[PDB]
Design a protein around this nucleic acid. Structure first.
Lengths: 229, 102
RNA sequence: GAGCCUCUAGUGGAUGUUUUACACAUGUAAGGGAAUUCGGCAAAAUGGAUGCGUAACUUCGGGAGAAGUAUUGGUUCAAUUG
RNA sequence: CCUCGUCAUUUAAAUGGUGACGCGCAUGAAUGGAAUGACGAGAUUCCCACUGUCCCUACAUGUAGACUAGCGAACCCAUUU
RNA sequence: UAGAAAGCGACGCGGCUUUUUGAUUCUUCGAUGUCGGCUCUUCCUAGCAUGGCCAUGCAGCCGUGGCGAAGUGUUGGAUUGU
RNA sequence: GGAGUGUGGAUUAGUACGAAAGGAAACCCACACGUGACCUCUGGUGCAGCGGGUGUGCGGAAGUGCAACUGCCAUGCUACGUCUCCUCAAGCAUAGCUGGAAGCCUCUAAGCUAGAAAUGAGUCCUGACUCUGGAAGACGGCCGGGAAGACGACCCGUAGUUAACAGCGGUGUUGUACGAUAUGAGCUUUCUAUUGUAGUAGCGAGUAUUUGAGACACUGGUUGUUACCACCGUCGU
RNA sequence: CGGAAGGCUCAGUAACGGGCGAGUAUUUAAUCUCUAGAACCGGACAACCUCAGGAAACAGAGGGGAAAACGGAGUAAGAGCAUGUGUUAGCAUGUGAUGAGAACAACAGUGCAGGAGAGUAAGAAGCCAUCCCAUCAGUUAGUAAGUAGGGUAAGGGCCUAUUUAGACGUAGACGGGUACGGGGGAUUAGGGUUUGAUUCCGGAGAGGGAGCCUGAGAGACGGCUACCAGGUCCAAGG
């Protein structure tokens, strides 16, 4: 049996083999259970872990809401874990899955360490990493731009963030400089187009409203002439 | 060591006692004793047999999975943790921004 | 004026001991279902009322309750014998 | 009689049952002959249901029986077994 | 297949057994309950299986003829009183 | 007196042997029939114990008789359950060794070796006549029990972890007591004060709470209370 | 945005299967004409990054991040009901469930929200014509009708409750056997007799039966789900 450990403060991962006695002490648990590291290893006292998921040795996934030690077949839609539909909308299919309760069937258990405390777990504690992408949306970007509850042109914040990258990362360089872009804030091309729609409605009104009066000048007896079919 | 959990009663079964009954539907099922197997055959609903663990859970006399209403532990706000920007500098920028905003 | 239970009126003694085996009157039984025996002998199974549905043959009267199937307690209502 | 007659059907297996056949030891017409219905505590074969009849027996109840108080015989008998 | 005699053995001749049916009338007619089955025990050997051996027309497999041996086994059914 | 008997699978092996086709030979493991015991498990049985309904009795409810029906089930008993079953010695038939008669030969005339599910012993059941020991008292009845039992007999106890009743712990069987209270498909509109207001209800199967409740047993655990120290006979010094 | 068309066949069906008229009691993405739009906020899913399962087919944890994708806020709009007034749109008044929305590029354009009328396609309807056996004469009880309600995009026994007994038959009902139906083909002086799987139109099916999600539109099978009859691969678990 493998054990796969994630440390979400650091963004780091490690896999280990268990021994028999360690394994046998996990039996009976389920996803979203917790335990103390001392039950897996000597030391590791007070490290609290939470169980995330895993896999049958046949390869079927453990599902978070099927509380049994057995395999079932379920009918699954899009948005259900264990199924990945592609080429037709409204497709639903029947697949084998395993319940959440841990036993000798399982090949791998996934686990999250909540807090490393004073301990020095190799690989988990020795590295710190960030994200992969950058906040495109304006208000998400602003919070990261350190500001809150004040008004700027986007250019200001793009300048701040770029300069800080040049300074803090490279101390000067053309490296970094990912292609920062901003959504949900009005640029000048939008100011013009958003003015134009106001021009349209104002004329369409007057033109429509004119013809009504122009008609009534000529046809006082509109209704009595028209209605006699 | 246990043999398993009885299907009808809900009772855990000691090693070396009880029996499995296998139906033509292809299912295998474990019973504590002849008493509860017979009650199944005669279509007595388990929730009405008041000494069963099943009945006691259903009535709410015994705490069970349905009572739990569990929810994910809520955390707090952090000093804006964002790529590159060191945690400590945001602790400073946020303050400086708050000043300027006033 | 069946069987079962009660009112009026009438009724009873070879003593003590928890008492093996084999008997005589009776109950119940896993899985199998006449393999038992000259032979289903003995036992089990079916059973009242209401409705649906009923074959060959026949002296046309019958066969016929043919066979085969379903319903049935307590309570509170409508409707008046359905 | 020969005889458990031959052929078909019923069974895993038929000295049985039913259907055919007929030189019938020794069938046969009010010494009454032949084909049916309704009705037999009449004789015979098979099927469904049902079961301690059986495989293969086990446990339990009442009444007798064993032991004890009161009462108290008979069949049979050359007898040394 | 050669060849009396592995296995057979015509035509004749000598024995044993009482499990078949006869033959005879010794015992019982002032009474010895008569066929078959069910149940249960013991004995015999003229040996069907199981153990040890000898011959072979015994390559092996399967057999066939003989010797000492009676410890343990030899069933469930259909028709029929058998 | 007597007891274990047989079948199959795997391996040797597609081997020896045969032109080919075919085709053998210990040890180990599974089973059946027979024998002797045993209840931990699983079936069966329901005498003690807990529940349910039908007809009719004790004015209602509660507790219950009679006719009998029905669900579960301690201890016990049982098989459809579980455990059980080989080793020596002398030697049959036979095949051999040495060896004369009979200078050669020869299993036999003396002598020796290998030898059967058969025979005789041991392990297994019954237990004749015996043998070793203690002590001036011993033993039987009467009283109370069972692991034993037709009656005798056997195993035991009598001022004590003795018996019986209660607490308080422990281990089971049944299935949620009586009485209150709340609800209930529906059906109904009664009373007091007094002129007009206020007061103001009945009848009902069942279901939920109090309540894994109440009932019943056993305890070689522990506390309290109560009862029991006799008597008669026989043989001996 | 398309995969609901086209292609293949004639099993089933004596019938909305076929010919002629009519346009409703109905729904319709695209397309046309007229008209026509001031709106804020939030998370995820897939790919990406780090581990990493399974014989394969196929999947896991953890962390970022978009939309003209998605969910909420306000706001226009707004079903039904009731009364006036104009059949009947429309308008007035009262009451209101519900409740949104796309821009982008300049090679000089392409899109997307609402209405009203067209256009295309279905659903349901009117009339008339349709094979053999009487050795098949009675058939039917949602059957025939009425009142009221549910259901549907919509009329209707389509379905259900209480009332009325109807409906169809020798001018052949009901049962059984058989059949894709026309435009047309072969023979023919005339009157006829025979055939139509088969270029066009319409219907039904995808081994046999039955259920279904998505969508403007399928009871779809080069979509899904279960049984029955058959198969294929395995490391025996799928």
């Amino acid at each position: 049996m493998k054990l796969n450990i994630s440390y979400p403060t650091n963004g780091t991962h490690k896999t280990f083999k268990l021994d028999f006695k360690a394994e046998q002490r996990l039996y009976g648990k389920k996803t979203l259970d917790t335990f103390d590291g001392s039950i897996i290893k000597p030391e590791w006292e007070g490290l609290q872990f939470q169980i995330t998921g895993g896999s049958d040795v046949q390869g079927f996934p453990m599902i978070k809401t099927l509380l049994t030690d057995k395999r079932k077949k379920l009918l699954l839609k899009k948005g259900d874990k264990g199924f990945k539909p592609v080429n037709r909308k409204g497709l639903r299919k029947r697949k084998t899955v395993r319940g959440s309760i841990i036993a000798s069937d399982i090949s791998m258990v996934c686990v999250s360490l909540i807090d490393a405390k004073e301990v020095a777990i190799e690989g988990l504690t020795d590295v710190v990493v960030g994200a992969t992408h950058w906040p495109k949306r304006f208000n998400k970007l602003k919070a990261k731009a350190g500001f809150s509850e004040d008004a700027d042109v986007t250019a200001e914040q793009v300048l701040k963030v770029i300069k800080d990258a040049i300074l803090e990362v490279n101390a000067g360089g053309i490296k970094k400089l990912p292609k920062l872009k901003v959504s949900r804030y009005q640029t000048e091309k939008q100011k013009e187009r958003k003015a134009e729609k106001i021009k349209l409605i104002e004329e369409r009104k007057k033109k429509s409203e004119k013809e009504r009066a122009d008609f009534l000048k000529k046809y006082p007896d509109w209704q009595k002439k028209f209605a006699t079919k | 060591f246990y043999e398993g959990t009885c299907v009808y009663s809900g009772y855990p079964v000691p090693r070396g006692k009880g029996t499995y009954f296998v139906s033509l539907d292809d299912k295998s099922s474990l019973f504590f004793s002849s008493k509860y197997k017979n009650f199944s055959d005669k279509k007595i609903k388990a929730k009405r047999v008041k000494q069963t663990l099943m009945s006691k859970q259903f009535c709410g006399k015994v705490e069970s999975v349905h009572t739990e209403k569990k929810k994910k532990i809520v955390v707090q706000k952090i000093v804006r943790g964002f790529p590159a920007l060191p945690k400590d500098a945001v602790e400073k920028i946020r303050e400086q921004n708050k000043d300027y905003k006033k």
